[PDB]
Amino acid sequence: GMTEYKLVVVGACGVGKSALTIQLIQNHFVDEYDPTIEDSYRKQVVIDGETSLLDILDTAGQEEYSAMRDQYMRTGEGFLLVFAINNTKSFEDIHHYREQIKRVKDSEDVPMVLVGNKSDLPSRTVDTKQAQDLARSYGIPFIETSAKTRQGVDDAFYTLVREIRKHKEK
Ligand SMILES: *CCC(=O)N1CC2(CCN(c3nc(N[C@H](CC(=O)NC)CC(C)C)nc(-c4cccc(N5CCOCC5)c4)n3)C2)C1
Ligand SMILES: Nc1nc2c(ncn2[C@@H]2O[C@H](COP(=O)(O)OP(=O)(O)O)[C@@H](O)[C@H]2O)c(=O)[nH]1
Numbered sequence: 001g002m003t004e005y006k007l008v009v010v011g012a013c014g015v016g017k018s019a020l021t022i023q024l025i026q027n028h029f030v031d032e033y034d035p036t037i038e039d040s041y042r043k044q045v046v047i048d049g050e051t052s053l054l055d056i057l058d059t060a061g062q063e064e065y066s067a068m069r070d071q072y073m074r075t076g077e078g079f080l081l082v083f084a085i086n087n088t089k090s091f092e093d094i095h096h097y098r099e100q101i102k103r104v105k106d107s108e109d110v111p112m113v114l115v116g117n118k119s120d121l122p123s124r125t126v127d128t129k130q131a132q133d134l135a136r137s138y139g140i141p142f143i144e145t146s147a148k149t150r151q152g153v154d155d156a157f158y159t160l161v162r163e164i165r166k167h168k169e170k
């Protein structure tokens with residue numbers, strides 16, 4: 001059989017949301033992607049031996065509110081909380097994303113994965129300890145990734161699917 005999962009990729013401008021998504025769906029790195037393009041993307045993969053259809057919303061745009069975001073916040077089953085390891089404010093922003101997702105779900109138990117992207121870059125400003133401890137406090141996995149090299153990209157998305165599977169079992 002197969003299973004479909006509705007995923008949402010959130011995080012500050014420029015953390016690599018589109019780059020991660022495109023690495024997953026097209027298997028290569030894109031340097032330039034219009035920051036105003038918010039859209040969902042479908043992709044069939046195989047995760048732990050089961051065919052998995054991913055429906056991924058790559059959040060974007062300058063708008064405070066988006067009908068598409070609203071829809072996926074309601075129906076999305078899992079959320080990728082992305083920050084760039086060289087941008088401290090993007091890490092500080094993670095709290096605000098998690099808080100909003102929890103409120104719309106009216107639940108403290110929403111499948112999420114914390115993603116520290118741009119792990120290839122030398123000049124990091126967010127310590128791995130901070131991120132590990134944050135994820136620890138949230139009770140969620142932390143995966144380090146690089147959309148550029150593709151390091152950890154499948155792990156981030158597949159880990160999120162595994163978290164969804166656990167949540168559906170409850
Ligand atoms: C460069 C473009 C890009 O990739 N961007 C800009 C954004 C778009 C989504 N962003 C965002 N979104 C929210 N809230 C969303 C609300 C919504 O659309 N509901 C239907 C829901 C999220 C996506 C789960 N919030 C923020 C945000 C970030 C940091 C601080 C705040 N403040 C905190 C203080 O109180 C006011 C909100 C909000 N950003 C950015 C991704
Ligand atoms: N070095 C490096 N650059 C990245 C990585 N991921 C994204 N970028 C770059 O960061 C910028 C923003 O990426 P983008 O996918 O547009 O971020 P978004 O605004 O969160 O969708 C682009 O110039 C990308 O090429 C990464 O893992 N490593």
Ligand SMILES: [Ca+2]
Binds near residue numbers: 033035037059060
């Ligand atoms: Ca984007």
